């Protein structure tokens, strides 16, 4: 996140952290949301690389211990079957993750809820992103968990020739551009999370930003639109 501000501990129970075994270490390398007790969310394009992953649920500092965690290793991965790594801009960055156990729910750690399918938010709908990912362009990693005010911008306006034109579908959220706000590299598979009927839903899954650089005016960051899935979602863990 850049132009992010540190979130309150409590605040955001369903996000995660997805990491992989670095050597003798485990590098933080996206986010996730908790749906099931034994699922998690993400982008596709964070399993492209097949590595060992695991998911921690109430983590708030990456590098220090908080009390709060719980680390379960990553049993499953079903990326969306039309999901294609050299085109993003295609559409279908989404992935679920069946966990090796199912954690324990508590104060830190919660489902986060999904929109009706079908959802589609009014321009400048009042979200937030979080995530541990770069807070400038080629920067580094948070430490602890980041939360920018991301004010959608709908299709029409997104698909404008100014902004991202052809390469958003209406499959996508776009959120921010005003160019000190984003998401970055390592915020990917994170929520959008946006205030519907005085419930935040998870409207985003963190995409893609542009080649140039995170906070980019008028290249809001791109989260696939979770509404466009909810019924591969429920068909998969119904099935799996
Ligand atoms: B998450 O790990 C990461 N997202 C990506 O690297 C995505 C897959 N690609 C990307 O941002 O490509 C740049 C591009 C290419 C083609 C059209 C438009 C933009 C981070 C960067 C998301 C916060
Ligand atoms: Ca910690």
New binding site residues.
Partial sequence: VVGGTEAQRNSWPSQISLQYRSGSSWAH??GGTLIRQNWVMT?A??VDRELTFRVVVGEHNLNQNNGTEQYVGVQKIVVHPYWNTDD??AGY?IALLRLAQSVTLNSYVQLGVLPRAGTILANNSPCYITGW?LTRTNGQLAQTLQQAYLPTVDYAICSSSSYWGS?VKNSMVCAGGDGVRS???G???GPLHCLVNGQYAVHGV??????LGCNVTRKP?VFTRVSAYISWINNVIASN
């Fill in positions: 390398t996206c982008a394009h964070c993003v801009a960055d990912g390469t998401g970055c590299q915020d990917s598979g963190t995409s893609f930003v542009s080649r960051t």
